[PDB]
Structures are given as C-alpha cells and as structure tokens.
Design a protein around this ligand. Structure first.
Ligand code: FAD
Ligand code: FAD
Ligand code: SF4
Ligand code: SF4
Ligand code: SF4
Ligand code: SF4
Ligand code: SF4
Ligand code: SF4
Ligand code: SF4
Ligand code: SF4
Ligand code: SF4
Ligand code: SF4
Ligand code: FES
Lengths: 296, 137, 662, 411
C-alpha cells in the first residue's frame, strides 16, 4: 500500500466534498493510502494569484511543498490547477538556484526551509502508472459495470501542457484518460476539439464571465453533438466551470444541455459501488439523475 | 613580481582553428597562455607534460577535438587516457593536479576558447607559483 | 644554423597591438638569429623578395616569419622559402596576429609585446632544429567511383567518363534517377522531369567509360588519395542481365524486360518509388522508365513459388538462389552523392499526418499528380477517392523550427515546389483553389520571383501564417486548418479537402554510415561537411573524396548539377596528373632503437604499422603511404624509436625549453 | 592431473625427497622434464656459498638438479630479466623455470612486451611469504638472535616467524616484531599480495599440507594444461607421487592466503601514508631523488624497462653531464612503469644511493590500478596505453560528469 500526502486544495473540500471522499475511499480500495496534509492551504492558484505576483506564488507553493517535506511523503493531487502550482514550483525550485535562495529567505521568516526532496503526482497519473495501481487493477476493483453510458472526457490544460514542461506525452490527441473511463465500463466518446480549454483558467472566470462562458459553450455544443451523457474531468476548476457555467449559460444565453459533470474519482466511486448520497451528487448544479438511471 | 607561466599544446584541426576563430572574432582574453601547435593531441607524449612541469610551468593546458571529431579518427582517445594518467601521477607526487587540464574545443568554438583561456588563467592565479621552482634549489 | 626572423605589420593589424621594433630587436639578440627584419605586408611580392634577398645575402639555413596563422599562409611562405635555395620545410611561423594582436588589442601593450617575444623565441627554437623533408608523391589509379545514382551522381559520372576516366556508379536501388525521377514537373520552367532526364539516363546506361552497378552498396573502404580499396556488396538481384547470362552460359539471353514474371507473380507489396501508394509484385521494376530494365526480385517478400521462372522460360533470367556477391575495386578518387529523404513529419502531431487520411506530404502529392502514378494522374482524396476542390499547402512543415522536433534550417526548395503544386492543381482541376499557409515565401533563384508572380496571378491564395493545428471533420473527412492571417490580423479556419505538408528534408538513410566509411565529417545541420565553406564547397578534408548534390545540403536540380560537375572536375584534377604529393609528416621508425615490442601497432587507426624482419631483429615497419602524420604512435613509443618528421620530440622539447628560457 | 586439481606430491627418489624443502616435487618435476626432454634447460636457484648466497643456474645435465633442491629465503633475485638478456628470450629453446610470485608477474610483463616466449617457458611457481636480503639476515641473526651467522644450517619463515637451525638447537622470533625493529622481509615483500602464483603452470607450497605429511609433501595446484601434462607425465613415469589433497588443507590454505592479503594491505597503508601528502610528498620525492648518481641499475633491473635506449639517456630530456640530476629522471620512470609495476623491489634494492624507488613506484601503481582496473602481471592483457578503447574513453569522460578533464575525477 503506497502512501501519499493528499493535498486537497480549495474547491474539492469546500464545494464538491464527494470528490475528496470518493478519492480517499477508492484510492484505499486500490493499493494507495492518501494521508491528510497538515495545515495545507490554497495552492496559490496559478491564474488568479500568479497573474498578480509570481514571487508570492513561489513562496506559497513552496510552503505547501515543505509541509509534505516535513511529513517525508510524496504529494498526491486531484486538481490540474493545483498540479500546475505545486508540481511546477517544485520542478522550478529544484533547478533554479537564485529562486531557491529567494524563496528560502522569504520562508526563513516563518522558520521553514525548502530543500527539494519529494515528488508530486496527480491521482489519475498514479491510477495509470503500472508500478502503482494500473488500468488492470482499476478494472479489477470495479464492481458495478456502468455499461451503456456515453462519457466525454475533458483533460484540462494544466496537467498536460506545455509538453516541453511535462512528461505525459502527446497533447494533441491523448487517450490515456479515455482508457481509465474505459476501465470503468463506460464507453468514452470523441467530440470535436476535445483538447480545448474550458475557459475558466487564468482568472478569466472572474474577470470576464461572458467570455469564459462562450469558451465553455463551444465545448458543451461539441459534447452534446457527440452525444455524451456525462463529462468526466480531472480538475475542480473545470468541474466548477462546466457545472455552474451550465446554469449561467442557461440564464445569460438561452442554451439548455443538462449534462452531468463528474470528477473521475466520483465515477470511480460509482463504479466501485459507493452510493450517490455518499458521493454528494446533490451538491452539483446539474442533476445527475438521468445518468444514474442509465448506469444503475 | 610573479606572472603565471601557462603552456598550451593545441591540436591543429580543432583547437588551433578555434583559437584562430576567437582571434578573428576579436574575443579578448588575458595574455598568459602560449601555445605549441601539434598536429593531433595523440602526438602529446606524457614526457612533454612532465618536462613542462619540471621546467616550471605553473599550469599546462592540452586542447583537442571533441570525442568523435578527431581529424585522425581516434587520436584524442589516446590523449585522453594519457592525460587521465598524468592527472593521477601529479596528485601522487604531491603537485596540485588542477595545474593541468585537457579541454575539448571544436573548430567553431572561439567563444569557448576565450572562456577556457580566462578560466585557466584564474585557476592558476588562485593556485600560485609552482613548488618545483623552489624545491630544486 | 642561421635563422632569419621577418616580422609582418599586417598593415597596422599587428603594429597597433605590439611594439614591432622591440620584437625585432629581441629577435636580433636571440641565439642562432642571423638577420631580423620587418615589413608591412610579408605575404606580398616585396615581402617574398625581402625573404629571398635575405636568404641569399646572409646564407640563411632557416626562415621564421612572425605573422598570421600557419593555416592561412604556410603554402605562401614555403614557396617563398623554396624560391631562394632552401627546402620548403626549413620554415616555421610564429602566429602573432590571430593569437596575439586581435585578442590583446585593448589596454595591454607591453604584455602583448612580451607574448610576441615568447612566440618568436619558441618559433626560432623549433626552426633551428628543423631539417629537410621532401613530400611523398604517390601514383593515382585512373578510375573513379561515384556513390549515388541521382541527378548529381549521374552528372558526375557522365562528366568524368566524358573526360575519359573510367568510372563506377554505385546505386543502392535497382535503378538510377533519384528523386528527380519521382518528380512530375519541374519549377520554374514546368518541364516534365522524366522527359528531360531520360536522355541523360540513356547516356549513362550506354557510356563505355561508366561501370553502372545498380543495387549495390559499399561495405568497406581503406586506402588514401592514391588507391582506395573499396569493397562492394552486389546484392542478390535475382535476375541476370544478358551479359551475365551469356557469361554463365545461357545463350538465349537474360532479362529483356518483357514483364511476364511480374504478370504471374502472386505476391503484392507496396512500391517504394510510388511512396507506397501503388502495388508491385515480388519481382518488379519501380517504373517503366528505369534505366537497367532488369526486374529485381524482392527476396524479403518472395515465396519462391517458381511461377516467375516458368513465365521467363527459355530466357532463364531468374535465379531464385542468388546470394550477395562481394567485389573489391581499386579507385583513385571518390564522389559522394547520397541525396536526401523527407523528415518524419508524423512527429508533429498537431498536423495529423498519419492520423488523418487526407493529409499527405509533398512527394506523395508529386506521385499522385504525376500521370504515371497510382492514379491516372488524377488527384483524388485518399479517404474516398473523390476529387478535391480546395487544397492547402503547409509550408515550413518541420523547418526553421527550434523546438527539437523539426529541423532548424530552411530546406531551400519547399516554397518553390509548393508554388508548382498549387499551379498544378489550379490547372488540372477546374475551379479548384489552392491555399498556401506561408511564413516567408523564398523565391530567390533565376525566374523564381516571376514564377511566384505568375502563381499569384493564376489565383493561389497566400495566407501569411504558420499553421497552428489541423482538425478533421468526423463525417466529410475534411480538414480544418487553424492559424492566424498575420497580415489581415485575424484568426482563420480554412476547411480544405486535401492538406499537403511541405516537409523538411534530411540526409538519406545510411548516409552517416557511408560518410563514416569514407572518413567525412558532418555539419552542424547534419549534412556532409565541405573543406572550406566558401571557397571549396565540393572537396572534403579527407583527400580524394568529394561531395555532390543534396548530400552536402538541400538544393534545386540546377545547383545540384553545378555542384556535381564541380566535384567531377575536382576528382579529375589528380587523375589527369597521375601524381599527387602527400604531406611529409609521416612516422619513421629508427630501427636500431626499436625493441620490437609491437605495442605501437594497435595505436594506428590506419594500420600503417606492422612488425617486420630487418637484420634478424624484429622491428616495426611504417607504410609511409598509409601514415597520416597524427603522431599517436610516436607519442606512445617509450624508447623514442618513432620519429615524427616535422614535429620531432627534439623540436617540440626545444620549443618548451625556449618558452621557459628567460 | 587436470587444470585445477589440488594434490599432495613428493619425490619417489628418497634423496630428492630429503633435500626438498618439503617433498621435493619441484626438483622431481624439473628433473623429469629435463631427462624426458620436454625442456632443453632448467633455470633454478642454487646456493653458491653459505645458504645466504643464491645464484641462478642454467642446468642441462639432469644430474645437477639435486643441487638446486631446497628453498633459499635470502634469494631476492628476479629470473625473467636474465632469460631475456643472456638466453635470447627463450626464442629458440624450451626452458623450465622455478619462479616466485614476482618472478611469474615479471614473466607476464615481459611477454606482454614481446621480450620472452611463454610458449617456450614452463613456469613452476612456488608460494612466497617473503624474502630477506642476505646481509640484513646476517645482521638480524648477529644482533636479535644472538648467534654467529656462519653457524646457521637452515633458516625459513614458517608460521609468521623466523626459524633458524644452528648448532645447539633452533630459535624463532615473530617476523612482525622483527619488522617493527627494522629487519625482516623486504619492504616490497611486506606490501606484496601475490602469494600463490595462479598465473604460473604449477603452484607448489607448504600451506595446506596437514597431518602425517606435514613436512614430507608439497601442496600442488595445477594451474594450466601444460602443468597438467607435466604432472601426469611425471606421475606415470614414476618420478613423483600423487595423492588428492585434504579438504581441510584446502580450507586452511585459503585462510592463510587471505590473512597474508590483509597483512599486505596493512603494510601498503602504513607505508603509503608514511610517504606524506601534498607538497610534503613532493619534498620527500625530490630530496630523495636528488641523490641519484645515474647508475641506471633501476632501469636495467626493472622487468618493465625493455627499451633499447632509455629516454633518461636522451640529451633533450636529461643533460648528459649534470650530476645532481633533474627530477625528470624519475618522472620518466613514473610515467613509463607506474601503470604496470609488479612490486619486485629490484629498483629499490640495487640503488647505490638508497632511494625508495619501489615504494614510490608502487604507491603510484596501486591507484593507477584502482583507476583503470588493470592488474599487472596476471595475464596477456595489453598495457593500458598500448590498448586504448573508444567506449572506455567515452565512459571515463561521462563518469566525470564534465566537459573536460579537470575535476570530479578523484575522491
Ligand atoms: C517534393 C519535391 C519536389 C521537388 N521539385 C523540384 C523541382 O520542381 N525542381 C527542382 O529543381 N528541384 C526540385 N526538388 C529538389 C530535387 O529533388 C533535388 O534538387 C535533387 O533531386 C537532388 O538530387 P541528388 O542526386 O542530389 O539526390 P537524390 O535525387 O536523392 O539522389 C540520391 C541517390 O543516391 C542513392 N543513394 C543514397 N544513399 C546511397 C548509398 N549509401 N549508396 C548508394 N546509393 C545511395 C539514392 O537511392 C538516390 O538514387 C524537389 C524536391 C522534393 C522533395
Ligand atoms: C624466498 C622464498 C619464500 C617462500 N615462502 C614460502 C611461504 O611463506 N610459504 C610457503 O608455503 N612456501 C613458501 N616458499 C616455497 C616453499 O619452499 C615450497 O614449499 C617449496 O618450494 C616446495 O617445493 P619442494 O620442496 O617440493 O621442492 P624443492 O626441492 O624445495 O624445490 C625448491 C625450488 O625452488 C627454487 N628456489 C630456491 N630458492 C629460490 C628463490 N629465492 N627464488 C626462486 N626459486 C628458488 C629451487 O631452485 C628449487 O628448484 C618460499 C620459497 C622461497 C624461495
Ligand atoms: S602575412 Fe599575414 S600578417 Fe602579414 S600582411 Fe599577410 S595576412 Fe597580414
Ligand atoms: S520474364 Fe524474365 S526476361 Fe521477362 S522481365 Fe521477367 S525476368 Fe526479365
Ligand atoms: S518465385 Fe513466386 S513469389 Fe517469387 S517472384 Fe517468382 S512468382 Fe513471385
Ligand atoms: S524553402 Fe520555404 S517552405 Fe521550405 S523551409 Fe524554407 S521557407 Fe519553409
Ligand atoms: S617503435 Fe617502439 S612501440 Fe613500436 S615496436 Fe618498436 S619499441 Fe615497440
Ligand atoms: S602517425 Fe603513427 S598512428 Fe598516426 S597514422 Fe602515422 S603511423 Fe599511424
Ligand atoms: S615480492 Fe612477493 S612474491 Fe616476490 S619474493 Fe617478495 S613476497 Fe615473494
Ligand atoms: S638505481 Fe638509484 S642511483 Fe642508480 S639511476 Fe636508479 S635511482 Fe639513480
Ligand atoms: S619499478 Fe621497481 S618495483 Fe616496480 S616493477 Fe620495476 S623493478 Fe619492480
Ligand atoms: S624508463 Fe621508459 S624509456 Fe627508459 S627503459 Fe624504462 S620503459 Fe624504456
Ligand atoms: S585532430 Fe585535434 S585532437 Fe586529433
């Protein structure tokens, strides 16, 4: 049973707690142990806080990293934006000496040092790796087939891009996340421009809601045209956009889709037999009941 | 009263070309190193280096082609093995082995030749006068 | 010994960095120096006259010139030393410009003067110990080899043969012609490629002075400028030419190219000439215009069914049990003309080359548009066989790219061939529109700008924007090309029926292996390197090897042919003379110091050293022709039994001693 | 009997078996080879005078090898260089040579450099726990043992102590105690670790012989097919008796060999740190080497020095008449020999000026060895500079993790 510190940023615990609950339960069912991070905070959200000040972005991400450093554990994440912040600041401060120095003399005011000893993983990346739980182990753990459901994957942008800074391979047409959805028994479908941004990154969600919603609506149109019955995602930002933004699209525009948006951990819980009440699917703006009727 | 005496033995086909290119491009560096110009660095016998160090070279530099880029297919592998062994001998006779180094400078690296010149001069200046000159007496 | 020291000013390039007067007075007070003197331009005729007058007056044994680099002016001053009654090799330079002045210009003058005095002292010390050498002259075999049967190889072979030298033309493939045989029409004149080349293919095939050896490779090369012992692998073609059949005893003949064999062969495989678009049997020719019309058998795919031999009948041209024969050929010079291949553009995933059906590259487009190709010359969509009406051309596909996937250089001809293809589609399909997504149209050659003007006049759309990514419509299989029109200032989404990628070119497959066999180095770009990038673009640093064609860097057919004839001329220079002088830097074994240990023998890359019998003692023997003067053996030998002719240990040690003299 | 067998061997002839130090198997094998005409001569050591004088001898009459029987512990000489100089390198005649570990290593060094013919030479190797200089042994016996040295009959290093047999009885003193007091084995013998010459054709010793044969049997290890043939021929013609060795004997032979390795390591340590470090080692080396009077005994005695004319004799390296000679003289030997020094000690012990040539050279050799991984004198592996390899050179440059040869090479 591999053990990881569970970073747990802002949106999953405070808006979609079923995501974190299913994360812990399903990760324990497969051979992974997710340990609470002691006093972790907002990973300085890369858009809304990196746009303001890169130095304080570095300092806060480094503080989050040195918490798990003192814990002597590897970070595990469930958010693409949190992955950007944590993993990328870890990678930058493992190689840039003057930035290490600057962050360290900022952190020395709170009796705290960064040395760069741990690694950062996304939970879906762990589920895909073969050393850690693999696709076959996921298939083994699945107990409810979830058959006869068309499911559209949204990769997001901060997990895989830029490919010159990550290690997940092709960004033009990846299929790895489609294999994790196929392990659950749901057939993943392909839609036009599947690698498009959801529109919520960089603080655009806050600065220009209509612009962000138009970017989201382009995706929703493509997904409905494909014929999806739900949208899996690996990011609480993207889930919030696809969930709230459907309501804001219904009100600001006149478009109705009613497409449930679920984190992959929530689908994994559904596959492994967790209850909808135990997943808190009532906390989503868009009702999941048609999808539950199909897969149950 | 003291100026470092550094001697370089540079091959004709990459290190001499690189030094010439640095000169042509007008890259300045201090005037402390004087060169010998053999055809390949395979020509450099160990006794050349040891003779330099016993005459009183504060430093010795041997510059040649990159591995795989010798004009004569493999003559700088022989030189590299010889200079590794020379580094070992100087360490065990108690002379400071950082007085000697072997750099691989291509025909197009005039800038790198200038940087090598500067770094060799700096290192020998830190090290100081060689001890042989007073140990002889 | 009596040495003269002549210090050049180089026209203030040296006098503006040091004190030439002080250097000259120091040279006068140096030991062994008879005369020291200075001049403004020692490389000029008054400078050589000054050297010669000094030699005659002062009875000089050797000459030291404190001037520019030896790599620039050894031949000049060696000839000046010869003219004057000395050996050319009693001369030594002291580089006090490119290694003293130009690097110690600013704010440091007496330091540069001291460096110059040191360099002059070391040069005088070496020259006081130099002695007479005579360059070795070696005979040159009167044959030549041309590796590559493309336009550059064929032009070089024809040029050498018509100059009268017997020539070998080695081609790995069963036919000569190269890429130009695959081209359909040619820019900027729109001539048919095969029509203009077939005359020259026939000339090569008929020339009595050319030994055309198709379907053959170069296993190994040893030797030098004089004699290159080149071993060739005659791959098992499986079919006999009439000459070989008569030699083996079959009077009725060999292969006449009737085609019955391929009419009955049941195996069907892709044709590499047609870039895989077209079928060909196990026994086959690339196209109907191949020069040796001899019908290779593909032994990796033949099932030995024996139908081909029954079809061939009494001609008996097919030998299904043939094996790779090896031949050793002695040649005087060699010309390398290996050409190029298209860079693998499936690595650029944003342009769905392998993943979308209707995305092709420019050689596949050229085969699709040729009238002899898999189609009847009709461009049709690969996805469904329908005629396109909008065609996009992605220029710079994988080129001028610093991301590590593509090539950082320009492929030279891809702007021109994309213009040609746009013209061809707009004239062959009525109402079709060509869109060129370009980033610097490069029409630099003769009539190229006029060709560009004419294409725009016929109505190709030029959108200045590098393509960002390509999406495939799920149903119509149409391709959505996304970029920005940089001049218009807006993003665009052009939906085309067919997308053509103008991919970069790279050195052919196996070219690095062949150039390592011949001893040629590579460029920064990865192409074969030339002797001097400006004034010698054909010859290489290894003597007797010359470059021709795209193998030295991408070029159009005109530039390729000019380069090929230049290489043929350079390869003919030593063959016509019949003599060639080697540089007397050889190793010479001093036998009554050799102990016969034999340890130096393995230190020679060229195998110039061996153990032999002289006066009962086993001593080492140098093949002075094979030696190249590197000095590895002579730097090894513990007993000092190997002497390097112009860089002897006493000379080098005298230089070291003079450096430490104060 | 076959290339790896470990045997007990003694001579059938009772007189040969008495005069052998152990069972006479080296003298029975040499006698058999000579008289059955495997070999045309035999190069062994005999006493020329008192047992402190060891004289090499080429023997062709099979009647003279009984005089060669017995081991002289004061025989500090080296045989293979004599075969190259005065027997034409054994290029035309077969020989059978009795040799210690240093003499086997020297055979292999000279055969690498093509100076002898190991196809012709047969090497019967003996175990060696150390040799004493004859004059130092005399002073040892006069002072520490309190005996007149001319009284001694035999003398041997057995169980790490120096047993002497004189008229009156026998005595014994620990060799470690003697070596602390300033006597004992030679310095290079204290540092030596070539205790069982497994590179020879046969290895004979008194280690591992236990029980009823503790002084009348030789432990033989057959180390090659040539030695197997010699032994089988001798046993069949009946000049030598063979019984398979005792497993307990094999075990304690291994233990004594291992303990000798450890002792050699300890002496290597204490000597090499006794030389100093940094500029102190340069003043030690330079002040010692300023004594050299250029007798060239070190060059003429070294097995690795095979050059017709030494570079130390060339006027562009060493000024011909300047007697307080340059440090270049010894730098030219460090450069040429230190990569393959077999620690024979001949250079140290033949120096009129008492310069620690072997100590300096071995101090350099041990870590040229741990750098390049080349053990001198074991087999036909070419010297490190006579065989340079492309892949290995890449490997040492990459291991430094550096673009040049400057640093990150040593710990
Ligand atoms: C799509 C496209 C269109 C083009 N259109 C034009 C045009 O319209 N006009 C124009 O002027 N130029 C055009 N060019 C450029 C033109 O093709 C080249 O200038 C020309 O072909 C160079 O010929 P080459 O002989 O140097 O090389 P190649 O034609 O490639 O010939 C090399 C030959 O050597 C052989 N070979 C390779 N390696 C070995 C080996 N190891 N041993 C033996 N043989 C070997 C190959 O099989 C081949 O036969 C075009 C290029 C492309 C890609
Ligand atoms: C200096 C020395 C130290 C030794 N130390 C040990 C030891 O610690 N442990 C051990 O087990 N064995 C040691 N031996 C070997 C020991 O003597 C063997 O047990 C013995 O050689 C067995 O042979 P043998 O009695 O059967 O034949 P022997 O009749 O003894 O034959 C001995 C052979 O050795 C030759 N010989 C004598 N002196 C020398 C010499 N100085 N150099 C070379 N050859 C010589 C003789 O000529 C003869 O051919 C040593 C030998 C020597 C010479
Ligand atoms: S010889 Fe060299 S330095 Fe002198 S004038 Fe000519 S180019 Fe200038
Ligand atoms: S049938 Fe025979 S002669 Fe005719 S093309 Fe085939 S191989 Fe040549
Ligand atoms: S043997 Fe059969 S498979 Fe081969 S070429 Fe002839 S017909 Fe074709
Ligand atoms: S020739 Fe034109 S299309 Fe080809 S790489 Fe250069 S600029 Fe791009
Ligand atoms: S020249 Fe030197 S290395 Fe070569 S065989 Fe003679 S002694 Fe040996
Ligand atoms: S100098 Fe020596 S090693 Fe080099 S090519 Fe000549 S003979 Fe061979
Ligand atoms: S050097 Fe070693 S093998 Fe030679 S006598 Fe001394 S201890 Fe024995
Ligand atoms: S043996 Fe001693 S004195 Fe004689 S040359 Fe060698 S070091 Fe000098
Ligand atoms: S240098 Fe001395 S100790 Fe080393 S092998 Fe030569 S003689 Fe023996
Ligand atoms: S020191 Fe060097 S040159 Fe002199 S004999 Fe020994 S190996 Fe030969
Ligand atoms: S040519 Fe420069 S190192 Fe060999």
């Amino acid at each position: 049973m591999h053990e990881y510190a569970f970073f747990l940023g802002c949106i999953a615990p405070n808006r979609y707690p079923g995501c974190e609950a299913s994360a812990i339960k399903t990760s324990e069912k497969v051979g992974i142990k997710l340990l609470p991070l002691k006093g972790a905070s907002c990973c300085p959200a890369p858009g809304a806080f990196g746009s303001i000040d890169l130095n304080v972005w570095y300092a806060m991400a480094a503080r989050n990293l040195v918490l798990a450093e003192e814990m002597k554990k590897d970070i595990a994440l469930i958010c693409n934006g949190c992955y950007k912040s944590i993993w990328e600041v870890n990678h930058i401060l493992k190689h840039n000496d003057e930035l290490r120095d600057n962050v360290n003399e900022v952190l020395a005011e709170i009796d705290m040092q960064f040395k760069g000893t741990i690694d950062v993983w996304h939970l879906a990346e762990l589920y895909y790796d073969d050393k850690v739980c693999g696709v076959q182990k996921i298939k083994d753990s699945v107990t409810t087939p979830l058959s006869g459901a068309k499911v559209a994957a949204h990769y997001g942008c901060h997990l895989m891009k830029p490919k010159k800074e990550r290690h997940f391979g092709d960004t033009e047409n990846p299929m790895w996340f489609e294999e994790l959805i196929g392990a659950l028994g749901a057939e993943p479908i392909q839609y036009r421009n599947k690698m498009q941004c959801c529109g919520a990154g960089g603080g655009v969600r806050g600065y220009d809601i209509v612009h962000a919603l138009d970017i989201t609506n382009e995706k929703l149109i493509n997904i409905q045209e494909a014929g999806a019955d739900a949208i899996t995602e690996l990011c609480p930002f993207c889930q919030l956009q696809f969930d709230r933004g459907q309501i804001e699209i219904k009100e600001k525009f006149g478009d109705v889709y009613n497409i449930p948006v679920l984190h992959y951990n929530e689908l994994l819980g559904l596959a492994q037999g967790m209850s909808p009440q135990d997943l808190a699917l009532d906390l989503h703006a868009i009702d999941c009941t048609p999808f539950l009727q199909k897969v149950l | 009263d003291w100026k470092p005496q550094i001697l370089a033995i540079i091959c004709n086909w990459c290190s001499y070309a690189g030094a010439d290119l640095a000169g042509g491009a007008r890259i300045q560096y201090p005037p402390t190193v004087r060169a010998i110009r053999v055809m390949c660095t395979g020509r450099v016998d160990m006794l050349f280096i040891l003779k330099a160090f016993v005459e009183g070279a504060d430093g010795v530099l041997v510059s040649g082609c990159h591995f795989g880029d010798c004009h004569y297919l493999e003559g700088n592998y022989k030189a590299a093995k010889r200079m590794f062994m020379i580094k070992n001998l100087l360490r065990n006779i108690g002379l400071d082995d950082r007085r000697f180094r072997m750099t691989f400078v291509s025909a197009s690296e005039g800038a790198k030749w200038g940087m090598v010149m500067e770094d060799v001069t700096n290192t020998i200046k830190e090290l100081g006068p060689s001890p042989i000159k007073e140990f002889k007496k | 010994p009596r040495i003269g020291v002549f210090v050049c000013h180089c026209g203030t390039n040296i006098a503006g960095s040091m004190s030439i007067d002080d250097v000259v007075n120091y040279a006068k007070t140096l030991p062994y120096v008879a005369v020291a003197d200075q001049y403004q331009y020692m490389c000029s005729t008054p400078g050589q006259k000054k050297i010669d007058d000094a030699i005659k007056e002062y009875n000089l044994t050797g000459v030291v010139v404190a001037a520019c680099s030896p790599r620039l002016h050894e031949p000049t001053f060696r000839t000046a030393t010869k003219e004057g009654g000395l050996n050319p090799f009693r001369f030594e330079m002291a580089n006090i410009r490119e290694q003293n002045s130009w690097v110690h210009m600013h704010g440091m003058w007496d330091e540069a003067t001291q460096k110059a005095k040191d360099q002059v002292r070391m040069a005088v010390a070496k020259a006081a110990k130099l002695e007479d050498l005579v360059p070795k002259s070696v005979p040159v075999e009167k044959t030549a080899m041309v590796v590559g049967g493309g336009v550059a190889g064929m032009q070089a072979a024809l040029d050498l043969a018509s100059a009268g030298i017997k020539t070998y033309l080695i081609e790995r493939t069963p036919t000569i012609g190269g890429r130009m045989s695959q081209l359909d029409k040619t820019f900027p004149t729109l001539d048919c490629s095969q029509c203009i080349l077939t005359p020259k293919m026939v000339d090569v095939g008929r020339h009595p002075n050319i030994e055309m050896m198709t379907y053959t490779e170069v296993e190994k090369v040893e030797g030098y400028i004089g004699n290159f012992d080149v071993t060739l692998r005659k791959k098992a073609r499986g079919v006999l030419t009439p000459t070989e059949a008569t030699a083996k005893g079959i009077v009725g003949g060999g292969c006449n190219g009737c085609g019955d064999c391929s009419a009955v062969c049941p195996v069907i495989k892709p044709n590499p000439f047609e870039m895989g678009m077209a079928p060909r049997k196990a026994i086959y020719i690339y196209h109907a215009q191949v020069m040796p019309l001899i019908y290779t058998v593909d032994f990796d795919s033949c099932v030995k069914c024996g139908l081909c031999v029954e079809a061939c009948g009494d001609k008996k041209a097919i030998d299904l049990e043939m094996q790779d024969e090896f031949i050793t050929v002695k040649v005087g010079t060699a010309v390398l003309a290996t050409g190029y291949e298209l860079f693998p553009i499936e690595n650029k995933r944003e342009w769905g080359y392998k993943q979308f059906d209707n995305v092709i590259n420019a050689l596949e487009f050229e085969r699709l548009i040729c009238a002899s190709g898999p189609t009847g010359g009709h461009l049709v969509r690969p996805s469904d066989g329908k005629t396109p009406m909008k065609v996009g051309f992605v220029l710079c596909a994988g080129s001028r790219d610093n991301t590590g996937i593509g090539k950082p250089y320009c492929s030279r001809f891809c702007c021109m061939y994309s213009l040609k293809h746009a013209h061809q589609i707009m004239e062959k399909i009525p109402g079709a529109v060509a869109y060129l997504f370009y980033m610097d149209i490069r029409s630099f050659g003769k009539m190229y700008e006029e060709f560009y003007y004419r294409i725009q006049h016929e109505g190709a759309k030029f959108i200045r924007g590098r393509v960002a990514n390509v999406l495939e419509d799920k149903e119509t299989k149409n391709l959505h090309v996304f970029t920005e029109d940089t001049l218009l200032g807006r993003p665009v989404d052009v939906e085309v029926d067919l997308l053509v990628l103008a991919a970069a070119v790279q050195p052919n497959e196996g070219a690095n292996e062949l150039r390592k066999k011949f001893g040629v180095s590579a460029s920064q770009d990865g192409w074969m390197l030339e002797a001097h990038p400006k004034l010698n673009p054909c010859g290489t640093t290894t003597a007797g090897v010359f470059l021709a064609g795209v193998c030295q860097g991408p070029k159009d057919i005109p530039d390729t042919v000019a380069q090929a004839e230049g290489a043929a001329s350079a390869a003919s220079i030593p063959i016509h003379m019949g003599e060639v002088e080697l540089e007397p830097y050889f190793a010479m074994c001093i036998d009554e110091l050799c102990a016969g240990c034999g340890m130096c023998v393995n230190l020679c890359p060229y195998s110039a050293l061996s153990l032999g019998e002289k006066n009962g003692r086993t001593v080492m023997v140098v093949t002075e022709a094979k030696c190249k003067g590197c000095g590895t053996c002579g730097g090894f030998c513990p007993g000092g039994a190997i002497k390097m002719q112009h860089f002897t240990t006493p000379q080098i040690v005298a230089q070291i001693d003079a450096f430490f003299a104060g | 009997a076959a290339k790896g067998d470990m045997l007990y061997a003694w001579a059938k002839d009772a007189e040969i078996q008495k005069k052998g130090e152990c069972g006479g198997a080296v003298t029975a094998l040499l006698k058999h080879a000579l008289e059955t005409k495997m070999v045309d001569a035999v190069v062994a050591i005999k006493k020329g005078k008192d047992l402190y004088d060891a004289v090499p001898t080429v023997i062709t009459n099979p009647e003279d090898i009984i005089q060669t029987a017995g081991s002289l512990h004061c025989g500090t000489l080296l045989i293979p260089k004599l075969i190259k100089k005065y027997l034409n390198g054994a290029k035309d005649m077969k020989l059978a040579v009795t040799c210690k570990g240093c003499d086997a290593m020297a055979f292999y060094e000279l055969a690498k450099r093509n100076q002898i013919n190991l196809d012709n030479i047969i090497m019967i190797g003996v175990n060696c726990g150390g040799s004493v200089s004859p004059v130092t042994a005399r002073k040892m016996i006069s002072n520490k043992f309190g005996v007149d040295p001319d009284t001694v009959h035999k003398e041997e290093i057995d169980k790490g102590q120096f047993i002497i047999e004189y008229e009156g009885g026998h005595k014994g003193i620990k060799i470690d105690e003697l070596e602390e007091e300033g006597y004992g084995r030679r310095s290079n013998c204290r540092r030596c670790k070539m205790k069982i010459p497994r590179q020879a054709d046969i290895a004979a010793g008194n280690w591992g012989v236990i029980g009823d044969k503790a002084g009348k049997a030789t432990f033989l290890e057959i180390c090659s097919e040539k030695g197997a043939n010699l032994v089988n021929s001798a046993q069949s013609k009946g000049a030598l008796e063979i019984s398979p060795a005792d497993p307990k004997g094999i075990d304690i032979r291994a233990k004594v060999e291992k303990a000798m390795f450890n002792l050699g390591d300890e002496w290597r340590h204490r000597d090499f740190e006794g030389m100093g470090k940094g500029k102190d080692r340069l003043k030690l080396m330079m002040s010692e080497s300023s004594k050299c009077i250029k007798c060239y005994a070190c060059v003429e005695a070294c097995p690795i020095c095979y050059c017709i004319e030494c570079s130390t004799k060339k006027p562009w390296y060493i000024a011909p008449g300047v007697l307080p000679t340059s440090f270049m003289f010894h730098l030219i030997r460090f450069a040429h020999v230190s990569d393959s020094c077999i620690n024979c000690g001949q250079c140290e012990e033949l120096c009129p000026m008492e310069i620690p040539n072997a100590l300096f050279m071995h101090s350099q050799q041990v870590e040229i060895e741990k750098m390049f991984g080349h053990i001198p004198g074991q087999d036909m592996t070419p010297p490190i500079h006579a065989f340079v390899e492309e892949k290995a050179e890449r490997a040492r440059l990459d291991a430094t993790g550096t673009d040049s040869i400057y640093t990150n090479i040593f710990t």
